[PDB]
Amino acid sequence: GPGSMDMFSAPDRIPEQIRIFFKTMKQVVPAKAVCGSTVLDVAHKNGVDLEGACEGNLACSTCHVILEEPLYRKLGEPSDKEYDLIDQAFGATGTSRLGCQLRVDKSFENAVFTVPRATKNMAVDGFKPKPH
Ligand code: FES
Numbered sequence: 001g002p003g004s005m006d007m008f009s010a011p012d013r014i015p016e017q018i019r020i021f022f023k024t025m026k027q028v029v030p031a032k033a034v035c036g037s038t039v040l041d042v043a044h045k046n047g048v049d050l051e052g053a054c055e056g057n058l059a060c061s062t063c064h065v066i067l068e069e070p071l072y073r074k075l076g077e078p079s080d081k082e083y084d085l086i087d088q089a090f091g092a093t094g095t096s097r098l099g100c101q102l103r104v105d106k107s108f109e110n111a112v113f114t115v116p117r118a119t120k121n122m123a124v125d126g127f128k129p130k131p132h
């Protein structure tokens with residue numbers, strides 16, 4: 001019975017828990033990552049003001065945050081498109097752009113999440129008749 005059984009459809013199986021770090025423009029604070037939780041969900045408990053708190057709302061332009069050099073490297077790198085896109089920015093690293101949905105795993109051990117961008121707040125809007 002030569003079989004592989006390597007791949008599985010049970011991603012819910014989260015490994016041991018780890019600890020992460022929340023770095024902001026003001027300072028960096030410690031964060032605890034528990035199996036079954038999420039980074040964005042952690043920042044809420046620790047108090048870190050992580051950009052998000054949205055569940056498919058309309059207030060969403062683009063998601064781009066800075067992540068650990070190595071953590072992001074192994075986590076995955078951008079493609080040609082994202083390469084030139086970010087390459088156009090001033091001293092912009094591919095680790096500055098990412099999605100908006102991650103889980104807590106062993107690979108997140110000592111993971112550093114740098115949030116250079118600011119959080120959403122009271123701000124007028126409507127001055128966009130013909131946005132290029
Ligand atoms: S969750 Fe709203 S832009 Fe990322």
